[model samples]
Target: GAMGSIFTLLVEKVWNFDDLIMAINSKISNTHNNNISPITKIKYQDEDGDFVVLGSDEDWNVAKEMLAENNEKFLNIRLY
Candidate 1:
């Protein structure tokens, strides 16, 4: 079945944990899959100044590969 809903995507500057939870709740309410849970993967900056949610395993791998090839300067940084 095809499902649709109006959703707003917010960025880091204006988003928080509560906002993410709200979004997840909205998605859950509209979807049939009850097992779906929000999984956020955070990648910390090398200098420990900032972090970013990498989405999923596939996303994390893609980011790792891209950063390794394009941004070798931060190759030593760990991803969590």
Candidate 2:
């Protein structure tokens, strides 16, 4: 189930290292569970100067929509 969920997220480009870490940290903060296995890792891409976050299916879906909204806003701002 985890692998399938992860694969779907990867296809959507909603998963990145930083987002994955943030998601896990959020989960830990909310649940106070320290025993959770680490499923994602964050790394810096020196050339791109970007942070990556890996996500699962649910997270990806949310992230995808958020990104799309942000992109739309940027475009609207440029036009206006």
Candidate 3:
């Protein structure tokens, strides 16, 4: 599932790092639980500025839509 969505975001929002960060922040804030790190949450210590991506045409289509949705929320609030 992470692969299904994250790479898509990474590609569509290559224009802005904050776009990616805010999007990821928004996702985790919306869905996280006590048991795990939120989906797309960046653990930069290991990320090394590159992860991996694999997508279908559908995923490419979805990422752009989701990145656009990130406009509704600012990344002002931080979540642990």
User: Residue 73 of model 3: what lDDT?
Assistant: 22
Ranking by lDDT: 1, 3, 2
Candidate 1 C-alpha error for residue 79, in Å: 11
- In candidate 2, how many Å is residue 21 off? 14
- What C-alpha lDDT do the candidate models reach, one value each? 0.41, 0.37, 0.39
Model 2 whole-model lDDT (C-alpha atoms): 0.37
Ranked by lDDT, the better of candidates 1 and 2 is 1
Q: In candidate 1, what are the lDDT values of residues 1-80, reduced to their tens digit?
A: 23523333332323344554455466545466556554333343433344544454454455445555643323221223
Number of clashes in model 3? 0
Candidate 3 residue 6 Cα shift, in angstroms, is: 6.9
* C-alpha lDDT of residue 27 in model 2: 44
Q: CA shift at 73, candidate 1, in angstroms? A: 8.5
Compute the lDDT of residue 69 as modeled in candidate 1: 60
